[PDB]
Homo-oligomer: 236 residues x 4
């Protein structure tokens, strides 16, 4: 379907949920997908096998995206196998929801390190590896909570709002070397609140993944520094 000049993609935290669908979608469109996981290899291998069954190209790779050295090593491993890397999706993320008055500084750092620091490392390394080839596209998976806020999510909103803003700054740095940076802000996705969603249902993971795909693809070639809402009309 969608046109891609590039040949491969790394997706952080891709073993399950939205990360998994991104991998499926992109593999189905001819990209070699690198599925990142932290601990359980079984789940990632099962996804890789499922894609290979369908004739697609996929590999798995173990690392903690919040660890600088692990992320650097992982990219070097990909560069050795494929000769380079055209696309990166920073999807790795956690939640630790508490009312602010009950929330320790450690709770805040936890979510900042895994959600925002992870993405900084990814975007930085994408910049290093893609500048050689003078081409690339990077997508940061943010959230409606980063635009709008939410009760009990001071730490998560902070990290996703920081991600959105940070992505703009990278877009300026990547622009002359033709490396684009964009964010997606999904609403409520499957895997009462529905009342407020105009389309009247939760979004599928696939619908988020096809938006990520568009931003990576050649079709979005004059789009950089933008935030793409995928929330069913919940926030406009």
């Amino acid at each position: 379907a969608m046109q891609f000049t590039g040949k491969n993609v790394l997706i952080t935290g891709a073993s399950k949920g939205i990360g998994a669908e991104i991998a499926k979608t992109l593999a189905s469109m001819g990209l070699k997908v690198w599925i990142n996981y932290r601990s359980n290899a079984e789940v990632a291998d099962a996804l890789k096998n499922e894609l290979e069954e369908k004739g697609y190209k996929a590999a798995v790779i173990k690392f903690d995206a919040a660890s600088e050295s692990d992320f650097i090593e992982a990219i070097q491993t990909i560069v050795q196998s494929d000769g380079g890397l055209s696309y990166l999706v920073n999807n790795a993320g956690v939640v630790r929801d508490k009312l602010a008055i009950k929330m320790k500084t450690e709770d805040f750092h936890h979510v900042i390190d895994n959600n925002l620091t992870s993405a900084f490392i990814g975007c930085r390394e994408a910049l290093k590896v893609m500048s050689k080839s003078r081409f690339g596209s990077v997508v940061n998976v943010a959230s409606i909570i980063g635009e709008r806020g939410n009760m009990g999510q001071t730490n998560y909103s902070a990290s996703k709002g920081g991600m959105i803003a940070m992505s703009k700054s990278f877009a300026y740095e990547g622009a002359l070397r033709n490396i684009r940076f964009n964010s997606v802000t999904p609403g409520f996705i499957e895997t009462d609140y529905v009342k407020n969603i105009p389309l009247n249902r939760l979004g599928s993971a696939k619908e988020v993944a096809e938006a990520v795909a568009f931003l990576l693809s050649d079709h979005s070639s004059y789009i950089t520094g933008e935030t793409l809402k995928v929330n069913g009309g919940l926030y406009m």
Copy 2:
């Protein structure tokens, strides 16, 4: 080959510029394209012929998109010809730039009538014809000037900012019947202070047209009431 459940599209003001590219791009993806024009049939026919020579489906249809009765009649013609209409692009637009102190009320009305009232009529009629079949997607071609403003463009910014806000309201009204409404906000397009554009060049009409296509396509099925920036990083 972006995926479309729908089979045809109407594009206002499609004889030339961005409108023409939208027609080319969508016809190349298997949609039957209705090319709207006001006065000169030669130009529209030439485009229609060009597309048919490539094996695509295209027709031309004459109307003033600011005239309610003309727009209604045109849609009824398309409904009888094809059986329905799945997609609409409100692209018809003009400029009449002057400093505000030099601008007459008629200068303001001119740009409001052709840019915003035209879009209201289109969105309204899209809602009537598409609600039957409980499916549709509509794109309003707005502008960076609608988000940001500009010297000498009080009337243009008014009309495009009104378009963007109006589109959101339609999105609420179309949501339960699965009719999506979205806006595109192009930056400067070929058709300088390129200095200020991070990607360091003007956008092509294609690049705007492929963003429109994405918002019409099935890939954007959880995206409604959104505004998609296509400005090369000039506004983030």
Copy 3:
């Protein structure tokens, strides 16, 4: 309270509701307030009398803000009385809510003319009158419906979204002559229980609360703020 370099203000549609409060608030801060009305003079005169009895300066002035010639004449009248005009608030506005499929073109024009065209005429004339003295501030009273949209309000959202964007363009044009243009976007204001659940501050806003925001954007305290949109919605939209 708030510091104003300017001496007077025109407020469109000021006889009642939010417009009235703006007039009260600004008169209470030492400005001479010009209260615009279309038809009923009784209500405007009552408000003018109330303010004079408190020691404030006020006058009333009749015009349709959607009529260019009426608005031009009104400004000339004010210029003759006071010698100039430092502040303008475009507050005149109407609603005509319908689902889009039931809405006539004339329903759309009605709201555009009264809400957006009115503001264009005000902002334009403000620019002409304030550029002489190289000083002014103008506020456009928009709405949360202009940022966010709403079912049944294709015409209103259009007009207020247009007003917001149009204000920014005027800000660029006014900037070198130190004429500032800004918008306020009020949420739901009193002058219910469905709306209120969703409002974090858990109540409708008062007219006074919108009027003190307008006042801040006119005042010297907002002197580095231009082309901005100030939300006054109790957290309903962030």
Copy 4:
């Protein structure tokens, strides 16, 4: 010049620049201002003295706003002196500008810790101390770079964009107990081609916007971001 129901305010990083003006402006409007500093007491004392000589109420207080235990202790000290605290301004901030490819992880953390973590701690404690009395207002000093991004400022934009989003979440949590949270996003401020008003903003102009958001005049404004950039971003 402005009405305040509350009686006092804490301002982080208030010894100099924008922080200092906020202190001057708020003290000149009848608030007792607590001037926070990290290291150099001379500068803070001089400011406190200057304000007392003018008849105003001021004190200084030493702490690192990025340190949870320091910030908690400081608020407890204020509560014992004044009986409570109605207003807080998270102004403490730094920059460490580099192109991303030249930027170490520690350069990133440095700016996150001092700009965003500092604000989290302030907002959280403001929530604890103001809930008692069911009244308060808090302002986060963010930046245009948080809305818009900038070359060489991946870390700064991250921290200020995070601050802007975070403040909204606090606004939800504070709303029940009538505690408002808002951000200011200043443009380029003095210690130009692109700025419509054609000059850098003064610190005073930022300080009067902060004051408005703390004052009773902004009582139906919460979760908002107030641009103070002279038209440089709209």
